[PDB]
Amino acid sequence: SAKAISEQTGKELLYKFICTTSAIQNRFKYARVTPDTDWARLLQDHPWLLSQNLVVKPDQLIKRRGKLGLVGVNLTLDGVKSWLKPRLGQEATVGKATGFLKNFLIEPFVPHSQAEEFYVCIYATREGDYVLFHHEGGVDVGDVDAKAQKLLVGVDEKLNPEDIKKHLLVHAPEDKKEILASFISGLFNFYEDLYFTYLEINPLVVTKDGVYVLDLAAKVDATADYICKVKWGDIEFPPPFGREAYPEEAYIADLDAKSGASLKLTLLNPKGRIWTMVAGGGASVVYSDTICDLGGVNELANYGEYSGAPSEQQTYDYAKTILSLMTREKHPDGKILIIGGSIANFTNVAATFKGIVRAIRDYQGPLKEHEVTIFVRRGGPNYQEGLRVMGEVGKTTGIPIHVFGTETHMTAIVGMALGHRPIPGKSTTLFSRHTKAIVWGMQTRAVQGMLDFDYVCSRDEPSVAAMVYPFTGDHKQKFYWGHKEILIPVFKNMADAMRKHPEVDVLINFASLRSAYDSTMETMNYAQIRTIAIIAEGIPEALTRKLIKKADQKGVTIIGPATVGGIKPGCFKIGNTGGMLDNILASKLYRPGSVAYVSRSGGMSNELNNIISRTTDGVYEGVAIGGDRYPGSTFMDHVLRYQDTPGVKMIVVLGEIGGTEEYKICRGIKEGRLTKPIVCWCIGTCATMQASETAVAKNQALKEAGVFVPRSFDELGEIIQSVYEDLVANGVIVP
Ligand SMILES: Nc1ncnc2c1ncn2[C@@H]1O[C@H](COP(=O)(O)OP(=O)(O)O)[C@@H](O)[C@H]1O
Ligand SMILES: [Mg+2]
Ligand SMILES: [Mg+2]
């Protein structure tokens, strides 16, 4: 994701890296101050502080400091010391946030007139980067989105200086135009080169002595560190202004940093009685939503997750932290721990649960004393053994631990735990029975996963015809088509694989993060490939925009990045989608049903497989578009395909807080483009504890347009079943 950086960080970056003919004054003239600052060292290190008057202000991602009286202007060093005395180390409140002011920036005062303050901003969107200028900068700039000249530098296009002069700068003083345009051009090259997604300078001051950057707010695309570490260095990403982290949050963050597994923890209410430990990002949000929906918002202790297949040791270190946090003080009503998640596609549930079980053993004493009750619900590879050992440690330690499989609706355990219930162009068709795919990368377990599936589907031929992996020479890989053993050619060069298999029209790209961009661009030089699944997570947003541009040009459908893929029962499945054969059979993914779905998350997609197979004639096609800011294909892209697929009789969409994608579905129904029944639920309803982008706003708006929206995830299965039964009754669905 994009992440904010401090003003000092961005200024430093700008002073180091910007190439402009325009004279930029006061380069590197800034000093940082905290409660631990030695004012003697500071002064020795920054003797310029004595040269001239100064400005002092906090650097903690607080907006509008001028208006809030947090900017000391035109002071001597002594005046600065005295302005800081009542403020430094003191609590301040800004909006809903309260925290200590502990980080200040000191800079030279820059005399200038109001007319010498300008406004400039650059920010990213799917279609390119907008450059904004306004000739009246400063604390009174106002609604700049409405007032500023704007220019869009399209994906993979250049910023033309003539447009800067003749459009962006039309209202600027004529004698500042040349210097403003040189600066702006420089600023944009800098923006793009260093992988910024947002960059605001207000005010940009221009006097007779040149350009001064008085203020700067920015975000960088943090996934681009593998490219930009050379320029960024050890760049820090500050948290929002607010409370400081608890040591446990720090511990887990450090844990997160040393692994591909995503490990996240945030304490909401350390004294809360409801603790969660959830596998899957989607599931993590859904469990929180559920807890809030059932009245538990004030008892919700934490939110977070442990995803992307962590190891036993990692899960143990995670679990031990939570167990420690929930035993610092007793709750008069005892405490609940929710160990839930969706149905994993590839995580080893046995390994992860063994880690949790070790932790429970280590903390059993305080756990019994604190009257902790534990609820467990989880699916995935080896989940049966995982559930068994969790039940065992309960019996063994004397701790109450109720365990549940995939027959139990994911969120049902929250109700049980709270006592609310007893404890018991681009094409329409992407895949078919004929689909042949090339798989880029050495993923033999995944490929065998696809063959096993093809086999139980009674496919005539295997769905994978060849592999591509440039890190070795041509050779053959051995796989099993049932008990029969077959060979699959592995090519060093993509061209070879393509030419020898012209019947292939799908590529599944398992390229690691550093190869994913190039291999995908290369693939789209071969028109036979109409569909590409991009698995890798962590591809920079600006690169994904280029992939999207080319795909749109080329008529190629892209699923991903950052996705497990998707599945079309009876015909084809992408890589690890759908887990082991165990889960393929239980969810009946070996033959088609009438229900198509789309979601961002693959974790929740497997859950949808489960839910849909228990409440209907089953999945017809499911797709996970992945959770990147700019997915190669959108909810609406697939919903449209589904509308145009006779075999699809109803459509399920699991949406999400953020963005406005789902409103396209509304307009689609109101314009008569979409006519099949659509079930939708947007997760993230409690996240709140622009507004049209909330899950709540969206659920309500979709409900009003004729979309079947349940009251909560917990009723999602019910409504899917109800809409289905009506479709059977009306002769639309023939099981
Ligand atoms: N170094 C400086 N020299 C002169 N004036 C300054 C300086 N820094 C800030 N100002 C004035 O203070 C105002 C607010 O400062 P700024 O850093 O933009 O904080 P914010 O936008 O958070 O209010 C600016 O619009 C500018 O007019
Ligand atoms: Mg400002
Ligand atoms: Mg990680």
UniProtKB/Swiss-Prot annotation:
Organism from which the protein derives: Homo sapiens
Q: What is its EC number?
A: 2.3.3.8
Keyword Glycoprotein (UniProt) = no
Q: Which reaction does it catalyse?
A: oxaloacetate + acetyl-CoA + ADP + phosphate = citrate + ATP + CoA
Residues that the record marks as modified (Phosphotyrosine) are Y130, Y620
Q: Which GO terms describe its biological process?
A: acetyl-CoA biosynthetic process; cholesterol biosynthetic process; citrate metabolic process; coenzyme A metabolic process; fatty acid biosynthetic process; lipid biosynthetic process; negative regulation of ferroptosis; oxaloacetate metabolic process
User: Cellular component GO terms, alphabetically?
Assistant: azurophil granule lumen; ciliary basal body; cytosol; extracellular exosome; extracellular region; ficolin-1-rich granule lumen; membrane; nucleoplasm
Q: Where citrate is bound, by residue?
A: G308, N345, T347, Y363, R378
Q: Any idea what this protein is called?
A: ATP-citrate synthase
Q: Which gene encodes it?
A: ACLY
Q: What would be an example GO MF term here?
A: ATP citrate synthase activity
